[PDB]
Amino acid sequence: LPGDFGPPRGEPIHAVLTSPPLVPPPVNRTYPAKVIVELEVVEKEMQISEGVSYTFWTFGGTVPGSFIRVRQGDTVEFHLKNHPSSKMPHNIDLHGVTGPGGGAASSFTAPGHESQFTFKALNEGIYVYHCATAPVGMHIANGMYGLILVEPPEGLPKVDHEYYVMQGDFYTAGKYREKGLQPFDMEKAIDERPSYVLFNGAEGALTGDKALHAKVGETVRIFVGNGGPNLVSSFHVIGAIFDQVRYEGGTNVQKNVQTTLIPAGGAAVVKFTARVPGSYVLVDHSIFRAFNKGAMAILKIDGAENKLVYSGKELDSVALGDRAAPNMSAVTKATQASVSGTLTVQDQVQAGRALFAGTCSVCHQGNGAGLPGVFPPLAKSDFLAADPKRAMNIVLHGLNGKIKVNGQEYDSVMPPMTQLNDDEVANILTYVLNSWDNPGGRVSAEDVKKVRAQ
Amino acid sequence: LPGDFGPPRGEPIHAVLTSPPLVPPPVNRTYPAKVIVELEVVEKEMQISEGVSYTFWTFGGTVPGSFIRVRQGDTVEFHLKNHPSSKMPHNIDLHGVTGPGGGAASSFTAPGHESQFTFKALNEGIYVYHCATAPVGMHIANGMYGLILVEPPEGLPKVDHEYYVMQGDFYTAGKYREKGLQPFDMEKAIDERPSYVLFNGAEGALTGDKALHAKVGETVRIFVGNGGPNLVSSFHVIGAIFDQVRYEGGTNVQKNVQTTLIPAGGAAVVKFTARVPGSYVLVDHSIFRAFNKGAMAILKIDGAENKLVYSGKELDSVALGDRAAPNMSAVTKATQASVSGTLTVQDQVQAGRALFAGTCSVCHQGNGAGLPGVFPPLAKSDFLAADPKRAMNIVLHGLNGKIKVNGQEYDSVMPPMTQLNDDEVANILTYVLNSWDNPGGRVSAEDVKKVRAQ
Amino acid sequence: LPGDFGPPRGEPIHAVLTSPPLVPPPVNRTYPAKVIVELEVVEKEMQISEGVSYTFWTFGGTVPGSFIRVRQGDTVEFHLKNHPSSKMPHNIDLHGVTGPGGGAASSFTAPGHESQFTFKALNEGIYVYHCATAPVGMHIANGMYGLILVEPPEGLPKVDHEYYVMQGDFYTAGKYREKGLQPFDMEKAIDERPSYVLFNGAEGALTGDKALHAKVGETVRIFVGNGGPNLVSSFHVIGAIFDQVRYEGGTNVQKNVQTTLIPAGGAAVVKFTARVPGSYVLVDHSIFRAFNKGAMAILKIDGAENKLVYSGKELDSVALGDRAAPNMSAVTKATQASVSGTLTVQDQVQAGRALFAGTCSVCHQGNGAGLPGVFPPLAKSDFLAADPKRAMNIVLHGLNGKIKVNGQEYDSVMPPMTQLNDDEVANILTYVLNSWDNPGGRVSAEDVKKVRAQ
Numbered sequence A, B, C: 001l002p003g004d005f006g007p008p009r010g011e012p013i014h015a016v017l018t019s020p021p022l023v024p025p026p027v028n029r030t031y032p033a034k035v036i037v038e039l040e041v042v043e044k045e046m047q048i049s050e051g052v053s054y055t056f057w058t059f060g061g062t063v064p065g066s067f068i069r070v071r072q073g074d075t076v077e078f079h080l081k082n083h084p085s086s087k088m089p090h091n092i093d094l095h096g097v098t099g100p101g102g103g104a105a106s107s108f109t110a111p112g113h114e115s116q117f118t119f120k121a122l123n124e125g126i127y128v129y130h131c132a133t134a135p136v137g138m139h140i141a142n143g144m145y146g147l148i149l150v151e152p153p154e155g156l157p158k159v160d161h162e163y164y165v166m167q168g169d170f171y172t173a174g175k176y177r178e179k180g181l182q183p184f185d186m187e188k189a190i191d192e193r194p195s196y197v198l199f200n201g202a203e204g205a206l207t208g209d210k211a212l213h214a215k216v217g218e219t220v221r222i223f224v225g226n227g228g229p230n231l232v233s234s235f236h237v238i239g240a241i242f243d244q245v246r247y248e249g250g251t252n253v254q255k256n257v258q259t260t261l262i263p264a265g266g267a268a269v270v271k272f273t274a275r276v277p278g279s280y281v282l283v284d285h286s287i288f289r290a291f292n293k294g295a296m297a298i299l300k301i302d303g304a305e306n307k308l309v310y311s312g313k314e315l316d317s318v319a320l321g322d323r324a325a326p327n328m329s330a331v332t333k334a335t336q337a338s339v340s341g342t343l344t345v346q347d348q349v350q351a352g353r354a355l356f357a358g359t360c361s362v363c364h365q366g367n368g369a370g371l372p373g374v375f376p377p378l379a380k381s382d383f384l385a386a387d388p389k390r391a392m393n394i395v396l397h398g399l400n401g402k403i404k405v406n407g408q409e410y411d412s413v414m415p416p417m418t419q420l421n422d423d424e425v426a427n428i429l430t431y432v433l434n435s436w437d438n439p440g441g442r443v444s445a446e447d448v449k450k451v452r453a454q
């Protein structure tokens, strides 16, 4: 067989598993070992977006699940525990396992129980693992996937950084960024119409203050998974190229590509060399996933600019929109305050400030000045102040035709923004009214609900 | 040109075509031949699922169509007959043909007619063929696709087994597993929202008693097609790895991969070596296709267990659901009896028994015992017996909150199962009521229709 | 770094950009140069289909945008101008640029403004460029994409022809071929449900009299882009094979394939050798895109037939439908005449003639004769003449069961054609009534609207 390195030697090894986006250290081993892996399923609510909760089903308390790292030819004794708070039974199918269901029949585990099976890791590569419990799509859609690396016997080449990034498609009953606890939506899932497409189980999980880091001249390896359940990723790095892309345990290695299709249930190892500083965006280049459903992650490179290679500026809110900033925690806070019935004007102002970036600032500017004759001002706007209810209609339904704002004629088009939720429109307009010498006061989510219903 | 092996020699050869999942024997030939291929289009109703009929349009009476096997450099005299029972005209486009439409203009054939064209097979590889008659998508959606292998002059390497598997997406007016003759649905097809995603033209075409077979240590080659019309397959083998994957006639060969994207209209040759016994599942890893729309096939390996490679059990209904069993013929029978107006309690019981596997048994167990305090019993259930109409609402709409069943409190969540058809809910509940000392009687499809409509 | 060819030498070069489907000449240069690229964004209405207008956002006035051709190691001084008629701000992200956003932050340009940034072209390959202005999906959906080729230092191998083809998915508020100015539809775009899938920004942009041309024995290189925003192309040539397919700047080259997946935001260079004359169709083999949404382009090869390679005929309306003919300009004219209120019978007749090809002619024949006993005649049809309102219902809703036409019984099935627009049904039936000794008169779009609404 392949991985014919003999029986296990040395001492039994208790695998150290890591949470995303971190990876266990290289096994750094010249002999096949008995590796004991202990993984516990936990069902729990987490924020899938600011002020949006979702009941995830997790291997090890994270989406994606704990990263497992073994050596080709190792004997793996796999212990799956199902936490007693669980409502569902669970199991595991690991890609790269030689045997029926990749462990599924022998790993079936009720709440409060433990299962074990043993396999030999014959196949070198990066592999998805996931729950295989009927209904399998519901389990995978709730977050039950991760990666197992089976190293070659000599190990992978040394790099400066190793990271763990996994795409998933998610199906909420509510629309994108609709606040509250969102149930799983079986109808959207069967139709392959996801509300969110995420890296590492949340909007902003790898943006702003949670970006991946490296320095100019350093090499970065990323273990990239696609848990699906349904989507194929047009996986892409903006402003850079992959030195290498290798799928699962394939003999084939692609070099010098920027865009690479990762199948549902697929995994790849990509290598990046940092050349110039700034934010490098990992996206699904099925572009409405990246810019409208959350499928964007950041590798931030620090070091000296090289103007002979690139004269341009760091990314800002024009491209990254409301994910240019370190975090959008003011949205989380304003959502919690609405639930408590303690929402203040300042709660709304700070939430609207976060949401205004890109969404509005691309045309009206970060300071609301616009561009005279081209984009009208929101700063000290006579037109805004004259009719706050008109302002709600303009955000939801757009505006075209001749208007006069602060003594100047405009004859342009503001597209409708009907996909913004009532709370988002209310908070954005409350921010504008309380900025730039505007008259103050507030717009409520309920005010916007009524304008939306006409 | 490529395939420059001279004029045909020897005697004219009448091609022996095979029905899926079988393949003609290797051509075993050192000279270029005139090969006469005779293929007849037949329009006919077949079961796309138990109790679900569909009017397929077929090359040779099967979906996929008859397998054609020739040698690179052969001259192929292609005869397409359209059976006189046909209502539509048909033609053929073969991938790997050098010339406009791959045969389409010269193979146009009305009902009761025959067409012929001649081509030289210049291009070695595995290739899709399909109907190219306006409207082309409707013809391909109805089943008009298959494979032609153009062997290299030296032939392919010897293997123990060669099989023929082809994915297709199907568009029925009714929902998945809705019984009766289902028309083609042009609106779903244009939207790329299929009701079924199948291997070899039916649910269960390659599961249970229709699984592919091999023995431990044997090599298996599978000629894998994607007829589409629309979907890209994340083609995957659960619990194994492909030794090799080669697309069409490509120079590139990928080795040691488990998951491989097959384009719409694409074909690949995959090679598998059997290492340990059990069921190896071929799926589209766009997971709701595999587990919710029918996209699963089985390679069953017999031979000795190797506990040093895999200690675990054969797949069961937890993973494979209602396709773990040899067949679901009791569903076909109960559907026919409903049509005839002769449906008995025992017809419903045997149909419900088949449908209970996975769907219900994953939590309630195959014997209905559940798990005390975790999953309540259906065996001798006081809660079930107290209100059969509540039971219908529980299956359709789910159940949460504190209940008491047979003296024990449960405080868990049963997800809704609204995608089950009225007949499926009726037959499942009739099985439960007539099992495990439950009070008997029956639930009708009409009973469930009324509860569904609230 | 890669592309380490030293500082720029010689004179500054003003890049000559080409409109699709043409490509600039090879750079034919042995030294690294300063290349000045001047690209202007223009927002303008164009015909996305006959009688269907759409407001495109373009780089250089075309979809795809102007083709840029430089050499690896060149220093590119990139000037982006936004025409003063523009309503939106715009920027550019070029794939293959080393730096944050691929130029996005430094190229942000309001209407009437100009931006510039400088980059070194370190990475050889074919690369997509596109707008990266919030909301990014809306900009790319409106047509803001093209290709930049970064040649290897030795240049690409010489070929007889180089062409420029780029797929895009488009989202109109109206249905496919619904006439008038069609707005962008954000809901369809977020759902990845396009109304059109096009090569080079229009139905028929590369069919009939706008086909690409070559001769038997000539080599053709096509630079193939997928601008998306959302779809992955199962990119395929009917009746031929690609000698080579190379993605972006990848080291991997696939040879001898017919079907190849191009990611959203991806690009490939394909090479074709012309062997026999006729029309070679480039399609997205997600077949309803190619045959129902416009995703078809033609390479027309002229030269001598080789009956030993292919005995068959050139493609006709059976396969290519209404795109077999040189153009469908009669539809454009009849749509303009409806708008003006000057639509004549002859305007409708010429439009219906164009639309009848394939749509109706596949069964009823180009001369309306049908096939006695199999497909009834439209020529001198007693059944058509007896009830013109029934004819409208037959096109919209189909026809089955026994009928008698011109003394012969038919017992067949005409599928419904409900996706045809009111104007298309009206014009097709007016063509039939005014042909083949039929009684004349006309059907109006309003007549069909009323029958459709029942």
Ligand code: HEC
Pocket (backbone or CB within 6 Å): A359, A360, A361, A362, A363, A364, A374, A375, A376, A377, A378, A381, A383, A384, A391, A394, A395, A399, A400, A401, A402, A403, A405, A410, A411, A412, A413, A414, A415, A417, A428, A429, A432, C088
């Ligand atoms: C893509 C450009 C663009 C974006 C994005 C945009 N606007 Fe506008 N907005 C305009 C233009 C142009 C006008 C003037 C329209 C006209 O000439 O009829 C306008 C007008 C307005 C007006 C009324 C005139 C004024 O200056 O007081 C308000 C209020 C406004 N926008 C608010 C917003 C808010 C809040 C956002 C984000 C939620 C937003 N806009 C996003 C372009 C934009």
Ligand code: HEC
Pocket (backbone or CB within 6 Å): A088, B359, B360, B361, B362, B363, B364, B374, B375, B376, B377, B378, B381, B383, B384, B391, B394, B395, B399, B400, B401, B402, B403, B405, B410, B411, B412, B413, B414, B415, B417, B428, B429, B432
């Ligand atoms: C994923 C788990 C799961 C699946 C699948 C499932 N159930 Fe349940 N079922 C439960 C749980 C948990 C409860 C108790 C809910 C509570 O605590 O409120 C339940 C309660 C019930 C009850 C009422 C209580 C009792 O024991 O009599 C019935 C009847 C029932 N299920 C039938 C079915 C049938 C029939 C199927 C399949 C069609 C099914 N269930 C599938 C978990 C499941």
Ligand code: HEC
Pocket (backbone or CB within 6 Å): B088, C359, C360, C361, C362, C363, C364, C374, C375, C376, C377, C378, C381, C383, C384, C391, C394, C395, C399, C400, C401, C402, C403, C405, C410, C411, C412, C413, C414, C415, C417, C428, C429, C432
């Ligand atoms: C795929 C085959 C097919 C296509 C495409 C088709 N038809 Fe028919 N058509 C038929 C058949 C078969 C019948 C007779 C149906 C029956 O036996 O009940 C028919 C009947 C008719 C009739 C009534 C009988 C007669 O001969 O006068 C009309 C009118 C007609 N078609 C018009 C059209 C028009 C206009 C188009 C295109 C818009 C069209 N058909 C496309 C197959 C087709």
Ligand SMILES: O=N[O-]
Pocket (backbone or CB within 6 Å): A236, A237, A238, A239, A283, A285, C093, C095, C102, C265
């Ligand atoms: O680089 N494109 O998103």
Ligand SMILES: O=N[O-]
Pocket (backbone or CB within 6 Å): A093, A095, A102, A265, B236, B237, B238, B239, B283, B285
């Ligand atoms: O192995 N996954 O379905």
Ligand SMILES: O=N[O-]
Pocket (backbone or CB within 6 Å): B093, B095, B102, B265, C236, C237, C238, C239, C283, C285
């Ligand atoms: O060759 N198929 O469209």
Ligand SMILES: [Cu+2]
Pocket (backbone or CB within 6 Å): A057, A088, A089, A090, A091, A131, A132, A133, A139, A144
């Ligand atoms: Cu699970």
Ligand SMILES: [Cu+2]
Pocket (backbone or CB within 6 Å): B057, B088, B089, B090, B091, B131, B132, B133, B139, B144
């Ligand atoms: Cu056909």
Ligand SMILES: [Cu+2]
Pocket (backbone or CB within 6 Å): C057, C088, C089, C090, C091, C131, C132, C133, C139, C144
């Ligand atoms: Cu733009």
